[PDB]
């Protein structure tokens, strides 16, 4: 169904580490893929262009961004500050799984994360709507300099966002 592609670059303290791209299954979910697409260009009054990261745990997951409005916890979606779910036809095969984050039922703000392992306890809760085709190496490189204390390579920030129209 001519699935779109999206990406964004990571900066390790005023230094470009590399780009990470993602392929979305708009074929399966031609609705929630757009949410992600828009969050790149980061119009509509939000996106990943906030140059900030939440946290990076080595050997679990990696992401950050979005929100930015309420003391670093903003976040509204293109369908509102909340949005229903779709389904769980997809599963968590392991690392390289792009899954959403949620804070309740029919409550999918926007923020997602990369699964760098078999998050079997997240399967069925989070929506899988894409995978990491290429960039896992950069993600790994990023995680290598992460920690559970909620600090990463000094101060990693989103350099720029992509959106491959």
């Amino acid at each position: 169904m001519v699935n779109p592609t999206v990406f964004f670059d990571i900066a390790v303290d005023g230094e470009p580490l590399g780009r990470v791209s993602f392929e979305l299954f708009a074929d399966k979910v031609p609705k929630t893929a757009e949410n992600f697409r828009a969050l790149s260009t980061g119009e509509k009054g939000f996106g990943y262009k906030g140059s900030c990261f939440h946290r990076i745990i080595p050997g679990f997951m990696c992401q950050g961004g979005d929100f930015t409005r309420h003391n670093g916890t903003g976040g509204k979606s293109i369908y509102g500050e909340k949005f229903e779910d779709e389904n769980f036809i997809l599963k968590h095969t392991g690392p390289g799984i792009l899954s959403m984050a949620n804070a309740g039922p029919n409550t999918n703000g926007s923020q997602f994360f990369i699964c760098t392992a078999k998050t079997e306890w997240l399967d069925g809760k989070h929506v899988v709507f894409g995978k990491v085709k290429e960039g896992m190496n950069i993600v790994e490189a990023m995680e290598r300099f992460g920690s559970r204390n909620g600090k990463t390579s000094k101060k990693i920030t989103i350099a720029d966002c992509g959106q491959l129209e």
Binding site: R55, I57, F60, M61, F67, T73, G75, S99, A101, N102, A103, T107, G109, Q111, F113, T119, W121, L122, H126
Partner: peptide
């Protein structure tokens, strides 16, 4: 812990 929600991450 190792959860991924959106509001008040705990251990």
């Amino acid at each position: 812990x190792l959860l991924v929600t959106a509001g008040l991450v705990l251990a």
